[PDB]
Design a protein around this ligand. Structure first.
Ligand SMILES: Nc1ncnc2c1ncn2[C@@H]1O[C@H](CSCC[C@H](N)C(=O)O)[C@@H](O)[C@H]1O
Length: 556
DNA sequence: CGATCGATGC
DNA sequence: GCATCGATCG
């Protein structure tokens, strides 16, 4: 199920992309450049990065000592053959685990593309060892441990050029990585390659260039960190101009002017600017232009608060066996195994998501809910009281009992892993999908369950009314989409944002007592009650955009 | 406990 | 194309 390429992260850097990284490294290198420079690739694969940096260095008449490490002998054998045939004799390859889970003196240059292996593939046990050894936190990825490991092999004032997944820039679990990078390096440049798809794998990579700090120093300050951001721009503004003077996508990585660029069948939006105070490592690092960052600043100052202050942003249920607990064909089961109607709760998924109004006009999904309120406490149901539902779960005994995290928690083998509080489903709530290219927050007061591909919003104050309607009008607006693309830059392919709790908690909210917020609430109340409204919903939506702009005191 | 994260995945 | 869904961590 898990390929050897998946578990070992064996994806080689393309030809032209490796050359781009090598050119930027040797341009940033302030070292001597007339002696032998030692270069390290801590996961060299077939030697692609070492070949690229030597080809560039030989043009500059620089002599390199190439060092490559890889724990796979097959990669070492092919890299030895390629390096030997290149003509360069001063190279050295080591077959070992670089993380050390027999010596090497520090190097002047590191060029790297470490493997990206998620915590689930590493396993919980190996992930704990990596966190304890390399001082990492959260859902650690392998490239994060390599980042710490390879940095400790770099001389002070040495240059690093390393390409990884861009997810440390915006995820909560990237906090330890951001802290380590800004602490150990004078950040030279961060390149967010976005959804350009240089690799055959579905990944959005970032390239980090930095000069390792020396323990004795100055103020630096003469170095201000810059960024380069390129994403696929599908929709083009009617008044925006496109530059088509570049032939290949790899040439766009060396442009030095922000704007729209078209290569073949796709248009790209390239942004250049400065990293703004990366020492604040607890929030995502924002890569935005001067105008975008200033607009982002004035919204926060004029904001009355944030969603986190007014409501609980929760995830839907996580059964950890969706094809067993969530079905639409309950009536088509054998009558001996059709669960009792008390247990089958209608559940809303992401494929029924629209703005304001739910697409519940066509739905039949129900969840076999396994929890209930008993003596004022949340307890799992007793199977003896539900014979038909018991037989159904008996047929799935081996798979449901395989969930080791359920048994080590001393919970019943048949339970839903995250059922939440059964009493909270009755409250009015906002629902929205996680993976979506557009906000689809909608009101729902029929007391149904929310699926794991959606999040839901319930107020902190027990007045489940106007406050939810205000939050909807804010979240669904184009105003908040602009704010989102600046502050929370976590994108999947095809322009999909991630509407996660850690992001939606930070949405700004205006004063719910101002006359502007009062009119927004009345318009949102109309959009959910008047399902006879069609097409001219856009008319109401436009009135909300101008109201939100006056509520935050800005014209965008 | 309850939200995260995805060299996405099928 | 286009929207995971289940191990995981705190
Ligand atoms: N623990 C470890 N120690 C050393 N190498 C490792 C490793 N885990 C994975 N690798 C190696 O890291 C490589 C990542 S693919 C990167 C290859 C090369 N850097 C390039 O850009 O083309 C794989 O070949 C894999 O064999």
């Amino acid at each position: 199920t898990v390929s050897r390429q998946k578990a070992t992260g064996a994806h080689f850097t393309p030809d032209k992309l490796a050359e781009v990284i090598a050119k930027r490294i040797l341009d940033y290198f302030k070292g001597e450049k007339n002696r032998v420079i030692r270069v390290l690739d801590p996961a060299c694969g077939d030697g692609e990065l070492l070949l690229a940096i030597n080809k560039v260095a030989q043009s500059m008449n620089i002599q390199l000592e190439l060092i490559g490490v890889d724990f796979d002998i097959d990669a070492i054998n092919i890299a030895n053959e390629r390096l030997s045939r290149s003509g360069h004799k001063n190279f050295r390859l080591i077959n070992k685990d670089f993380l050390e889970m027999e010596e090497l003196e520090p190097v002047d240059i590191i060029i790297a593309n470490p493997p990206y292996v998620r915590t689930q593939i590493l396993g919980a046990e190996k992930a704990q060892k990596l966190r304890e050894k390399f001082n990492l936190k959260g859902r650690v990825d392998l490239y994060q441990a390599f980042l710490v490991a390879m940095t400790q092999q770099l001389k002070s004032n040495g240059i690093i050029g390393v390409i990884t997944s861009n997810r440390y820039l915006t995820t909560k679990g990237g906090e330890s990585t951001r802290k380590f990078l800004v602490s150990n390096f004078n950040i030279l440049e961060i390149m967010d390659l976005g959804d350009s798809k240089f690799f055959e794998a579905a990944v959005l990579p970032a390239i980090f260039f930095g000069e390792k700090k020396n323990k004795e120093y100055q103020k630096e300050n003469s170095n201000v960190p810059k960024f380069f951001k390129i994403y696929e721009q599908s929709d083009i503004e009617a008044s925006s101009s496109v530059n088509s003077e570049f032939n290949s996508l790899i040439e766009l990585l060396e442009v030095n002017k922000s704007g729209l660029y078209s290569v073949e069948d796709k248009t790209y939006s390239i942004s250049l600017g400065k990293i703004i105070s990366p020492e604040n490592y607890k929030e995502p690092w924002i890569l935005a232009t001067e105008d975008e960052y200033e607009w982002f600043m004035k919204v926060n100052q004029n904001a009355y608060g944030f969603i986190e202050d007014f409501a609980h942003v929760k995830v839907g249920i996580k059964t950890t066996a969706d094809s067993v607990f969530i079905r639409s064909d309950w009536g088509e089961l054998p009558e001996e195994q059709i669960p009792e109607d008390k247990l089958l709760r209608p559940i809303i998924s992401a494929d029924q998501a629209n703005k304001w109004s739910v697409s519940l006009v066509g739905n039949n999904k129900k969840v076999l809910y396994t929890h209930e309120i008993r003596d004022g406490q949340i307890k799992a149901i007793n199977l003896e009281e539900f014979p038909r539902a018991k037989n159904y779960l008996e047929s799935h005994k081996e798979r449901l009992a395989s969930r080791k995290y359920v048994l080590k928690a001393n919970r019943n083998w048949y339970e839903i892993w995250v059922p939440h509080d059964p009493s909270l489903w009755d409250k009015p709530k906002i629902i929205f999908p996680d993976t979506s290219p557009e906000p689809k927050f909608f009101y729902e007061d029929k007391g149904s369950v929310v699926d794991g591909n959606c999040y839901w919003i319930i107020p902190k104050k027990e007045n489940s009314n106007d406050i939810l309607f205000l939050i909807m009008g804010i979240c669904n607006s184009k105003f908040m989409s602009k704010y989102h693309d600046i502050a929370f830059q976590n994108k999947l392919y095809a322009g999909r944002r991630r509407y996660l709790t850690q992001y939606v908690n930070k949405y700004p909210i205006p004063d719910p007592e101002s006359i502007y917020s009062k009119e927004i609430i009345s318009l949102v109340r109309e959009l959910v009650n008047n399902k006879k409204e069609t097409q001219d919903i856009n008319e109401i939506e436009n009135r909300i955009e101008k109201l939100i702009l006056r509520a935050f005191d800005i014209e965008s």
